[PDB]
């Protein structure tokens, strides 16, 4: 159950087409994770949801509402 990557030989992890958020970094763009019956999968990283913006030369989007969100920063 061997998978070949630029990082090296990867043994005991099953390749998958699906991409997800990077979970455990192997390098050269492959991250591995525990997922479903559960096993270890190695996948190409997902850089985030694809989102084209409905741009045009006369269209503007105005927020109509707000959320006060408090975040934590630790140093």
């Amino acid at each position: 159950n061997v998978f070949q990557t630029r990082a090296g030989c990867l043994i005991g992890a099953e390749h998958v087409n699906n991409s997800y958020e990077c979970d455990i970094p192997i390098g050269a763009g492959i991250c591995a994770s525990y997922q479903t019956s559960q096993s270890i999968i190695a996948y190409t990283m997902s850089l985030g949801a694809e989102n084209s913006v409905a741009y045009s030369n006369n269209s503007i989007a105005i927020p109509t509402n707000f959320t006060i969100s408090v975040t934590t920063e630790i140093l």
Binding site: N57, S59, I62, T64, N65, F66, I68, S69, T72
Partner: protein, 226 residues
């Protein structure tokens, strides 16, 4: 509404901190590296460094000084070399913290003591205010931020012709709900009727591109008529 959004938002911070320690990783990391470094320091004591015995007294015993000096000297060079590494690691690691402290000072001086217009320097999104909380060997900030949530599509125009004179908004931008033209503030939908008060005239229609015909209501004239 904002009070409720703020009060609940503080509430979640408890729960995220109450159950998961993944947030506190950064401070815990500093403790481990320093604590782990000392373990390496004391561990080197047991190492022989190529001498008959690692225990110094056993060298003082088990043979007279004139030969024992050679064995001790081998011990010293090993131990002395261990400090050279350990100290040199601290200075470099100490420099890292001091760089982090100066960032904290700037972040404290510029986030809690005042509003900061630097984007993403004090929390994601538009910044309102910040709270410091002390933490073991560190500081924890609560960045209270304003995040615009729900948006709408509106047709917009750079400027408005009224009598052959271009009109530009004093503040905010022109938005049309499809049949009527309004000026609304930049970050919130608060449509309000076009007036000479909202708009300052400049130049002539032809030069601007995309300018749209409409009417600019004038407050004074009905007052004059009535």
């Amino acid at each position: 509404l904002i009070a409720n959004q703020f009060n609940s938002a503080i509430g979640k911070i408890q729960d995220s901190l109450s159950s998961t320690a993944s947030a506190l990783g950064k401070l815990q990391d500093v403790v481990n590296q320093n604590a782990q470094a000392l373990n390496t320091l004391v561990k080197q004591l047991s190492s022989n460094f190529g001498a008959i015995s690692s225990v110094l007294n056993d060298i003082l015993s088990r043979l007279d000084p004139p030969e024992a000096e050679v064995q001790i000297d081998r011990l010293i060079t090993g131990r002395l070399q261990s400090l050279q590494t350990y100290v040199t690691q601290q200075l470099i690691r100490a420099a890292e913290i001091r760089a982090s402290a100066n960032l904290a000072a700037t972040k404290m001086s510029e986030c809690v003591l005042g509003q900061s217009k630097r984007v993403d320097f004090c929390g994601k999104g538009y910044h309102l205010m910040s709270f410091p909380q002390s933490a073991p060997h560190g500081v924890v900030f609560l960045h209270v931020t304003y995040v615009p949530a729900q948006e709408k599509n509106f047709t917009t125009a750079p400027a408005i012709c009224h009598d052959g004179k271009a009109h530009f908004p004093r503040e905010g931008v022109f938005v049309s709900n499809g049949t009527h033209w309004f000026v609304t503030q930049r970050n919130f939908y608060e449509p309000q009727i076009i007036t000479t008060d909202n708009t300052f005239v400049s130049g002539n229609c032809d030069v601007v591109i995309g300018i749209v015909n409409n009417t600019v209501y004038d407050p004074l004239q009905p007052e004059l008529d009535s």
